[PDB]
Amino acid sequence: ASAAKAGDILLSHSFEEGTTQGWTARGGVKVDVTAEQAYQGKQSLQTTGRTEAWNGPSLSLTDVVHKNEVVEISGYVKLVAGSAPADLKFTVERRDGNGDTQYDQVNAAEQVTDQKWVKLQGQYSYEQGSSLLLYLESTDAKAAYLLDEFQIRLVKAAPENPGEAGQALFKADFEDGNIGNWRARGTEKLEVVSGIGHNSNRSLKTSSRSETYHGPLVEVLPYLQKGSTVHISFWAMYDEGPATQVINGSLEKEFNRDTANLEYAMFASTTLNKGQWKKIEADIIVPAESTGISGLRMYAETPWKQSSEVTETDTIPFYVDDVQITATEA
């Protein structure tokens, strides 16, 4: 039940109030606020007395960053006067699932100087861990430096209800409210609705359908091993019209960037009861590289009829949710 949402600020430190705002010494160092220099405002965070590369100012992230969240960590840095140029980076010390120490890289090291403030920035996430310690490090073990306008932003919330270990290659739950790369096939309308979903708040609605082939489509080739065997699954529901309706799950294939000569293949179909969610699934073979395959797109449709024979019941709007592609091998 994640509180924070994408784009939300988790932490912001300007060091303007003469407290280190949670930052402390890692190793035998001196970490304090200074009013001597700053990026913004009057004050910044100073670190001196380093003697080992791993020494630095540190900040506990245990209560800030959660499992599988993607966050963005940033700050401005500058070397203390009289310091030789040196390379700086953010690192996260993490205790893994079995209490072993891991060292996670946040950003790639940047050359920093005593003349000028430099922006450090990177994205971070973790799958398993008990404690998290962010620190600002240099390979120069003697280097002393300032930090200011430090910030942590939430980029992507943790998915919800993350079963069987086949490895999830592709997932769409729509909970972030985002249509992403999903597109219409013709003139129909795609919309991420809230208040309707499969054991969830949101799902992908397709409406204003006027042809049977109209339905939601997404390119999936990039997420997949060419030649592999994978399991495609999604959930569908329709809420109006007849007592029963068939939905199909199909694949649209493109070879050698030839857009004029597509191949189509149905992988599954099921009969749905009005108002009920039902799983549509199958194993499929991703075409081999030798085929010259350049596009592979999954979609949902109602069974094919010619335009002249198309009725109000063929063109029903429907919802799709918990779309998922998993590997068969691990």
26 forms part of the interface with Ca ion (CB under 5 A): no
| Residue 324 interacts with Ca ion (CB under 5 A): yes or no | no
Q: Interface mask (CB under 5 A) for Ca ion, residues 124-163, using x and -?
A: ------------------------x---------------
d(CA 65, CA 51): 29
Least separation in angstroms between CB 108 and Ca ion: 24
Q: Are 158 and 6 in contact (CB under 8 A)?
A: no
**129 vs 197, beta carbon nearer Ca ion:** 197
In the complex, the smallest distance separating the C-beta of residue 34 from Ca ion, rounded to whole angstroms, is 10
Q: Which residue is nearest to Ca ion (CB)?
A: 200
Q: Which two tokens stand for residue 268?
A: 């599954």
Whichever of 40 and 105 has its CB closer to Ca ion, that residue is 40
The dihedral built from the CA positions of residue 185, 223, 324 and 329, taken in this order, carries a sign that is positive
Nearer residue to Ca ion within complex by CB, 79 or 296: 79
Which one, 44 or 248, has the nearer CB to Ca ion?
44
Chain centroid to CA 2? 15
How near is the Cβ of 117 to Ca ion at its closest, in Å? 11
Which of 137, 173 has the CB closer to Ca ion?
173
DSSP secondary structure string for all residues of 39-85: SSSS-EEEEE---STT-EEEEE-TTTS-TT-EEEEEEEEEEPTTPPP
**Shortest distance in whole angstroms from residue 176 CB to Ca ion:** 10
Query: How far apart are alpha carbons 77 and 86 in whole angstroms?
Result: 11
* CB of 280 closer than 8 Å to CB of 231: no
Q: Which residues contact 200 (CB under 8 A, 6 or more apart)?
A: 160, 161, 173, 174, 175, 321, 322
Pick one of 254, 321, 323, 325: the residue that binds Ca ion (CB under 5 A): 321
Give the nearer residue to Ca ion in terms of CB position, either 44 or 302.
44
Place of tokens 């191949």: 263
Q: Which is nearer to Ca ion, 140 or 175 (CB)?
A: 175
For Ca ion, give the closer residue by CB, 245 or 324. 324
In whole angstroms, the minimum distance from the beta carbon of 23 to Ca ion comes to 13
| Site membership for Ca ion, residue 202 (CB under 5 A) | yes
Among 10, 29, 33, 38, binds Ca ion (CB under 5 A): 38
At 312, give phi and psi (nearest 5°). Answer: -55, -30
Binding of Ca ion by 14 (CB under 5 A): yes
Report the C-alpha gap between 300 and 58 in whole angstroms.
50
**Identified binder of Ca ion from the candidate list 69, 93, 140, 173, rule CB under 5 A:** 173
Longest dimension (CA), the chain: 83
Is residue 212 involved in binding Ca ion (CB under 5 A)?
no
Q: Which of 234, 232, 237 is nearest to 265 (CA)?
A: 232
Footprint on this chain of Ca ion (rule: CB under 5 A)? 14-15, 38, 40-41, 43-44, 148, 173-174, 197, 200, 202-203, 321
